[PDB]
Design a binder for this molecule. Structure first.
Ligand SMILES: O=C(O)c1nc([C@@H]2CCCN2C(=O)COc2ccccc2)[nH]c(=O)c1O
Ligand SMILES: [Mn+2]
Ligand SMILES: [Mn+2]
Length: 176
């Protein structure tokens, strides 16, 4: 999984995932499935953009969580949007709402429901992606155009297929 993660993901993404796990008392080399899951979730957050023109999305994920909260505060003060109780993944400057991104090896609908229960607030948008080319979003609002989401689904499916050829997929699917 390590050898796969180092080869499959960008070195900056690998460095961020190593920090997040060591920060939470877990080592990248034993809980290898968490290593790959954190790398994949980070990548999806980076691709969550229409890829053109303005900086529509503030990426909250992948940053020092203490510092990321000050950014959420600054947005809420300027925008007036209610403050989320849990640190979201992105903020949409066009729709003026926070986004929680989910990447699951389980089903998109059951993973959305768990997120919605935990989020509690109806204001934070939820967008779930799977490794099987499916997605689920709040009120069927997928935020991005279909080509941007197609890039994410194909990348996730590509990750899924690359793991499967190395016999790593089934264990990665069961770790969740
Ligand atoms: O998408 C998601 O599932 C998602 N989940 C979380 C959960 C909530 C509790 C803390 N936590 C984390 O994973 C915090 O990092 C960790 C935790 C354990 C090991 C390594 C890193 N946080 C999100 O920001 C997020 O996007
Ligand atoms: Mn997050
Ligand atoms: Mn997330």
């Amino acid at each position: 999984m390590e050898d796969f993660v180092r080869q499959c993901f960008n070195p900056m993404i690998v460095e961020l995932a190593e920090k997040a796990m060591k920060e939470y008392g877990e080592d990248p080399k034993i809980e290898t499935n968490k290593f790959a899951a954190i790398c994949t979730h980070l990548e999806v957050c980076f691709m969550y953009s229409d890829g053109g023109s303005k900086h529509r999305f503030e990426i909250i994920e992948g940053r020092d969580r203490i510092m990321a909260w000050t950014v959420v505060n600054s947005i809420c003060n300027t925008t007036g949007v209610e403050k989320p109780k849990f640190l979201p993944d992105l903020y949409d400057y066009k729709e003026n709402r926070f986004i929680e991104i989910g990447v699951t090896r389980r089903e998109v609908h059951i993973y959305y429901l768990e997120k919605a229960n935990k989020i509690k607030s109806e204001k934070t948008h939820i967008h779930i992606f799977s490794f099987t080319g499916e997605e689920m979003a709040t009120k069927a609002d997928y935020t991005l155009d279909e080509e941007s989401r197609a890039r994410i689904k194909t990348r996730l499916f590509t990750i899924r297929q690359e793991m499967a050829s190395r016999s790593l997929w089934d264990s990665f699917r069961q770790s969740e």
